Amino acid sequence: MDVFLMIRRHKTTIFTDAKESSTVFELKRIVEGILKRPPDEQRLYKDDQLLDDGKTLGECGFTSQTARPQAPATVGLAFRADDTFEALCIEPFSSPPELPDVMK
């Protein structure tokens, strides 16, 4: 089963899909091809929770119910500067304007 994801760090968002049976490490390889940082310099998160490399995406809570094309699940991403990992930190998207009176 395909799961549909947004991998997010700071102001970067990667839209991609993966198999529910694929691993967290395998997702880091995907990220490596795109952002050119190796898996050992990456941490992936679900919400505040650090994910283990060997776990499947399904075991980390990414399923067809929660990770749909039109509403993908978010995976947090943090890089290691050199010695230490940065704190997980996702800039929110912009706020929509107030509903015009005619729509309210």
Binding site: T13, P69, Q70, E91, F93, P96
Partner: protein, 87 residues
């Protein structure tokens, strides 16, 4: 070149599969590996990217298609973006 970068008006960088982006005639033309959108904010561009995924997944599919959701608060701007990007 598997991926392209779509940059919102507020600086958010959206990385999507090139073939997903190329479904917009406008984006194809702007590429022909990064595109800046001075008028499209991130809360609209994120949804645009979700639409790509939705379209590619459900086009020419015997499965039951779910509704593509749009919150009222983004509907106007998303409409303007969809008109511009032609889709």
């Amino acid at each position: 070149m598997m991926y392209v970068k779509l940059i919102s008006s507020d600086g958010h960088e959206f990385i999507v599969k090139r073939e997903h982006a190329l479904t917009s005639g406008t984006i194809k033309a702007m590429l022909s590996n990064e595109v800046n959108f001075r008028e499209i904010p991130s809360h609209v561009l994120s949804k645009v990217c979700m639409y790509f995924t939705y379209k590619v997944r459900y086009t020419n599919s015997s499965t039951e298609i779910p509704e593509f959701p749009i919150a009222p608060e983004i509907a106007l701007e998303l409409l303007m973006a969809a008109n511009f990007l032609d889709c």
